[PDB]
Amino acid sequence: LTNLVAEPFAKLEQDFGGSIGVYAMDTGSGATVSYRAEERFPLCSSFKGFLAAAVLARSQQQAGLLDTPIRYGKNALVPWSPISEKYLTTGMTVAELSAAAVQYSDNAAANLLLKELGGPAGLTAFMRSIGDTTFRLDRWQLELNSAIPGDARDTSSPRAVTESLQKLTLGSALAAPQRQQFVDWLKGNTTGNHRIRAAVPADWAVGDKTGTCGVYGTANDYAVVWPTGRAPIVLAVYTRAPNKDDKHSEAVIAAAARLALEGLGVNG
Numbered sequence: 001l002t003n004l005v006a007e008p009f010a011k012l013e014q015d016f017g018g019s020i021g022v023y024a025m026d027t028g029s030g031a032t033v034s035y036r037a038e039e040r041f042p043l044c045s046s047f048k049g050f051l052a053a054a055v056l057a058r059s060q061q062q063a064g065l066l067d068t069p070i071r072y073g074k075n076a077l078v079p080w081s082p083i084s085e086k087y088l089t090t091g092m093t094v095a096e097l098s099a100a101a102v103q104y105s106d107n108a109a110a111n112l113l114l115k116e117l118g119g120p121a122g123l124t125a126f127m128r129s130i131g132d133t134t135f136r137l138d139r140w141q142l143e144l145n146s147a148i149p150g151d152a153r154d155t156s157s158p159r160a161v162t163e164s165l166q167k168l169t170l171g172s173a174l175a176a177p178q179r180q181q182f183v184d185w186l187k188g189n190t191t192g193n194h195r196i197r198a199a200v201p202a203d204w205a206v207g208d209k210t211g212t213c214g215v216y217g218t219a220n221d222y223a224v225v226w227p228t229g230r231a232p233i234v235l236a237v238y239t240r241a242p243n244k245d246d247k248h249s250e251a252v253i254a255a256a257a258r259l260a261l262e263g264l265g266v267n268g
């Protein structure tokens, strides 16, 4: 049931000038679309979705975790921290930091939460606990975005991303209240309008998390999509390119998502 219908991913990545990795699963039938799906691609900021899931998982044990106030100094602010910079003088709750990391890709919020979780190894440990043996986070922001060709640090594969996203949003990896909170955060993301969402009709529900490393044409998006009247689709689209100064392309991500949905026979 893999790649029942051929789609021109190769032409698309050749036009882009790099490599595109796609996994998409129709959770009703089990049909999948897979292109470079087991290759490693830099996570960039897309690790933050899993980070928020790991926070939610911990909150199942720690009742009051999500409402815990977190105060931070100016030294915690790193570039691209649009929410946390507005609450520097007040602090934010763990839940607010999680929402900011997911929905605005706030970099300082993610670093604060990563520290709370025991760093990159703690997030990696959470991913191992749900059966993901591919994911690895190795560094903190912003160093984790270096996207060096051939470097496995701070990478995963499109397939592992999609499988883990499925477990967390639709499967049993989170308890039901935490699962719906994770879905709600992803649905509220503001940074993905030109990526997977651009391939998804407006009348379908979608949640996603983006990543943009800033170098090596490296950017990504993963999403759960609820077409009306059929089972949800889970998919991941990751890109990279050989030269440091190669630009990423949102349009290539949207185009690859379109091809994935077409390959699954989902009418858009």
Ligand SMILES: *C(=O)[C@@H](NC(=O)/C(=N/OC)c1csc(N)n1)[C@@H]1N=C(C(=O)O)C(=C)CS1
Binding pocket: 044, 045, 046, 079, 080, 105, 106, 107, 142, 145, 191, 209, 210, 211, 212, 213, 214, 215
């Ligand atoms: C996650 O990917 C974060 N990306 C960045 O901080 C960088 N963006 O470059 C445009 C970066 C870090 S080091 C370097 N040379 N560049 C945040 N995530 C989002 C997203 O989710 O796409 C952004 C678009 C920018 S900030």
